[PDB]
């Protein structure tokens, strides 16, 4: 019984390690943008839209 | 000319009325600038609470 429990736990732990290795590996892909605002109180362009 | 005189007077009055609207538009510009700044600040705090 102890041997069976040990082998089952070993297999489960090995699978969990294989998963968790890549789980911790590339977890920085969550870096994205937040798109805050600044009120753009300094835009003083001219009316020359020809490019559309 | 008399009619040109009345026309120039009316046009200068129209200029002055446009200046009164210039004042009102200035007030709109200033208050909306306050709104812009307040929105910048509130958006910053909302994003922080999101974090």
UniProtKB/Swiss-Prot annotation, chain A:
Domain of life where this protein originates: Eukaryota
Residues recorded with modification Phosphoserine: 8, 41
Post-translational modification: Phosphorylation by STK4/MST1 alters its binding affinity to TNNC1 (cardiac Tn-C) and TNNT2 (cardiac Tn-T).
Assembly with partners or alone: Interacts with TRIM63. Binds to actin and tropomyosin. Interacts with STK4/MST1.
Function: Troponin I is the inhibitory subunit of troponin, the thin filament regulatory complex which confers calcium-sensitivity to striated muscle actomyosin ATPase activity.
Family: Belongs to the troponin I family.
Protein name from the UniProt record: Troponin I, cardiac muscle
Organism: Mus musculus
From Swiss-Prot, chain B:
Family assignment from sequence similarity: Belongs to the tropomyosin family.
Biological role stated in the UniProt entry: Binds to actin filaments in muscle and non-muscle cells. Plays a central role, in association with the troponin complex, in the calcium dependent regulation of vertebrate striated muscle contraction. Smooth muscle contraction is regulated by interaction with caldesmon. In non-muscle cells is implicated in stabilizing cytoskeleton actin filaments.
Domain notes: The molecule is in a coiled coil structure that is formed by 2 polypeptide chains. The sequence exhibits a prominent seven-residues periodicity.
Organism: Mus musculus (Mouse)
Protein name: Tropomyosin alpha-1 chain
Domain of life of the native organism: Eukaryota
UniProt miscellaneous comment: The sequences of cardiac and skeletal muscles are identical.
Phylogenetic lineage: Eukaryota, Metazoa, Chordata, Craniata, Vertebrata
Transmembrane regions listed in the UniProt entry: none
Quaternary structure annotation from Swiss-Prot or TrEMBL: Homodimer. Heterodimer of an alpha (TPM1, TPM3 or TPM4) and a beta (TPM2) chain. Interacts with HRG (via the HRR domain); the interaction contributes to the antiangiogenic properties of the histidine/proline-rich region (HRR) of HRG. Interacts (via N-terminus) with LMOD2 (via N-terminus) and TMOD1 (via N-terminus).
Signal sequence annotation: none
Induction: Induced in stimulated quiescent cells.
Subcellular location: Cytoplasm, Cytoskeleton
């Amino acid at each position: 019984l102890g041997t069976r429990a040990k082998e089952s736990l070993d297999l489960r732990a090995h699978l969990k390690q294989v998963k968790k290795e890549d789980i911790e590996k590339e977890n920085r892909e969550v870096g994205d943008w937040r798109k805050n605002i600044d009120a753009l109180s300094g835009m003083e362009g001219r009316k020359k839209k020809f490019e559309g | 000319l008399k009619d040109a005189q009345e026309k120039l007077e009316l046009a200068e009055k129209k200029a002055t009325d446009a200046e009164a609207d210039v004042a009102s538009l200035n007030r709109r510009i200033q208050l909306v600038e306050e709104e812009l700044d307040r929105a910048q600040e509130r958006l910053a705090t909302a994003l922080q609470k999101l974090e």
